[PDB]
Amino acid sequence: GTLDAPFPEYQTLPADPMSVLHNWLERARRVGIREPRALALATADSQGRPSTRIVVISEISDAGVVFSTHAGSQKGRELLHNPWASGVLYWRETSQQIILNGQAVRLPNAKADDAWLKRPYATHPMSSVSRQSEELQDVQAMRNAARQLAELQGPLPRPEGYCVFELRLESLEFWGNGQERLHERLRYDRSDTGWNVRRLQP
Amino acid sequence: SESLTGTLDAPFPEYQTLPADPMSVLHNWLERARRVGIREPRALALATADSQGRPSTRIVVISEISDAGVVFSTHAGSQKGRELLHNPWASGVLYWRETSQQIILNGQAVRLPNAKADDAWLKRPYATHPMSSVSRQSEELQDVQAMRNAARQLAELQGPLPRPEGYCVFELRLESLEFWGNGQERLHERLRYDRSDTGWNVRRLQP
Ligand SMILES: Cc1cc2nc3c(=O)[nH]c(=O)nc-3n(C[C@H](O)[C@H](O)[C@H](O)COP(=O)(O)O)c2cc1C
Numbered sequence: 001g002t003l004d005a006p007f008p009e010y011q012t013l014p015a016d017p018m019s020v021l022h023n024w025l026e027r028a029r030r031v032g033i034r035e036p037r038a039l040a041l042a043t044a045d046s047q048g049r050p051s052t053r054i055v056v057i058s059e060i061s062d063a064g065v066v067f068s069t070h071a072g073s074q075k076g077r078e079l080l081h082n083p084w085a086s087g088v089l090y091w092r093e094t095s096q097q098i099i100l101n102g103q104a105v106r107l108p109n110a111k112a113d114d115a116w117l118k119r120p121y122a123t124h125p126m127s128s129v130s131r132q133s134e135e136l137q138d139v140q141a142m143r144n145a146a147r148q149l150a151e152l153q154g155p156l157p158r159p160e161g162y163c164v165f166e167l168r169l170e171s172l173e174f175w176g177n178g179q180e181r182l183h184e185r186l187r188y189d190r191s192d193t194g195w196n197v198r199r200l201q202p
Numbered sequence: 203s204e205s206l207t208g209t210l211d212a213p214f215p216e217y218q219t220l221p222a223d224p225m226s227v228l229h230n231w232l233e234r235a236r237r238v239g240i241r242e243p244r245a246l247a248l249a250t251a252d253s254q255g256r257p258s259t260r261i262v263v264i265s266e267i268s269d270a271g272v273v274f275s276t277h278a279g280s281q282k283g284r285e286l287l288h289n290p291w292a293s294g295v296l297y298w299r300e301t302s303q304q305i306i307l308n309g310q311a312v313r314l315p316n317a318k319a320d321d322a323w324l325k326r327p328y329a330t331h332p333m334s335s336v337s338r339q340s341e342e343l344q345d346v347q348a349m350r351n352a353a354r355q356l357a358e359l360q361g362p363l364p365r366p367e368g369y370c371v372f373e374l375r376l377e378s379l380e381f382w383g384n385g386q387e388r389l390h391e392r393l394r395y396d397r398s399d400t401g402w403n404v405r406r407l408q409p
């Protein structure tokens with residue numbers, strides 16, 4: 001409640017939520033919100049049990065948001081059989097949330113190559129040696145094998161399984177704290193002609 | 203940009219020692235967070251799922267840590283409430299930027315008796331009662347001013363209101379948890395617990 005938190009969209013109801021999304025992220029970066037792109041990303045298994053973890057949104061796309069992960073991780077396995085996902089951004093400084101609902105699709109390997117090459121190279125060793133989310137049987141062995149690759153110069157090859165997902169959005173909500181506890185919820189839903197928009201009760 | 207910003211020391215001896223009882227690790231971490239001044243440590247990004255297994259998320263606050271798990275309150279008619287009533291399975295993550303810690307909490311949410319919900323409602327500062335009484339959380343809001351005006355009328359009272367129908371307390375009774383620390387040299391420290399027939403199985407996970 002500590003930085004300014006303007007929400008004129010709640011009055012004016014903009015037609016295109018992708019444009020609001022881009023505006024909120026720009027405002028977050030320029031006012032210096034701490035890790036605004038840390039998304040709590042929910043997926044579910046074949047019984048419909050949810051799982052969560054943080055991932056970083058690396059781009060906004062025409063259809064949604066983009067992140068990278070490993071295909072054999074829990075989220076990658078869930079996504080493979082059930083593409084429906086939801087993520088939330090929560091910015092403590094302005095008391096704002098963004099809720100993002102949709103289906104995530106794995107992008108082609110060339111896109112993954114590029115994502116990999118644009119990471120700081122210090123991240124290649126461990127992300128190459130680790131099989132994300134599998135049982136870790138020997139900590140020291142992993143540390144030693146990664147140190148072997150850390151010593152090398154330049155980028156490493158993209159490991160099989162390193163992959164990029166686009167979460168193509170079917171609904172979003174923008175949430176602000178409002179006045180007198182009337183929290184402001186702007187809710188958008190894709191239609192076959194564009195986007196529908198409504199306010200929700202707090 | 204993909205970088206974490208945490209700089210506070212965050213001792214994670216439990217990654218080496220593998221305590222048998224994961225709720226002790228949850229208590230340690232939460233108490234550490236309290237002592238070092240983490241901002242809103244208990245803002246929980248909670249996921250539930252609809253009848254087709256499609257997830258939804260929002261932040262709720264963990265109001266208590268119980269023997270079985272963690273407690274929060276909400277409205278039974280909300281999206282999360284309707285989802286939990288049909289599919290009790292849920293997952294929440296806490297993430298603390300200052301220490302680079304994450305806590306993932308998975309299990310089944312059970313609605314606790316009304317006496318519990320009465321208690322929880324009463325413990326709320328009564329200033330929160332007016333808006334929570336007039337709002338049917340997550341249904342469309344047709345007229346913002348009518349809502350504001352109606353709460354303001356109730357706020358005249360300057361005291362506790364009766365608990366609304368729908369106001370409720372869920373306990374998330376945990377079946378699995380992960381404690382995640384940044385570790386050294388990007389070997390992120392992942393301590394994973396899963397309920398057994400008695401006690402818990404524990405393992406480490408690859409970063
Ligand atoms: C701030 C933060 C950002 C993270 N960003 C990513 C990311 O973008 N991609 C990723 O695979 N894991 C990321 N992780 C690690 C994930 O939370 C998780 O440990 C890993 O992806 C395995 O999740 P899973 O076992 O649920 O599939 C991040 C962790 C933290 C705490």
Ligand SMILES: Cc1cc2nc3c(=O)[nH]c(=O)nc-3n(C[C@H](O)[C@H](O)[C@H](O)COP(=O)(O)O)c2cc1C
Pocket residue numbers: 090095096097175202245258259260261262263264274275276277280281282283339340
């Ligand atoms: C910091 C913060 C804490 C919140 N705590 C709660 C809470 O504990 N209980 C609750 O019902 N909603 C809480 N909310 C509001 C929810 O995020 C959400 O707007 C509301 O519960 C409706 O969720 P739903 O439509 O997905 O069911 C909180 C919001 C913020 C940003």
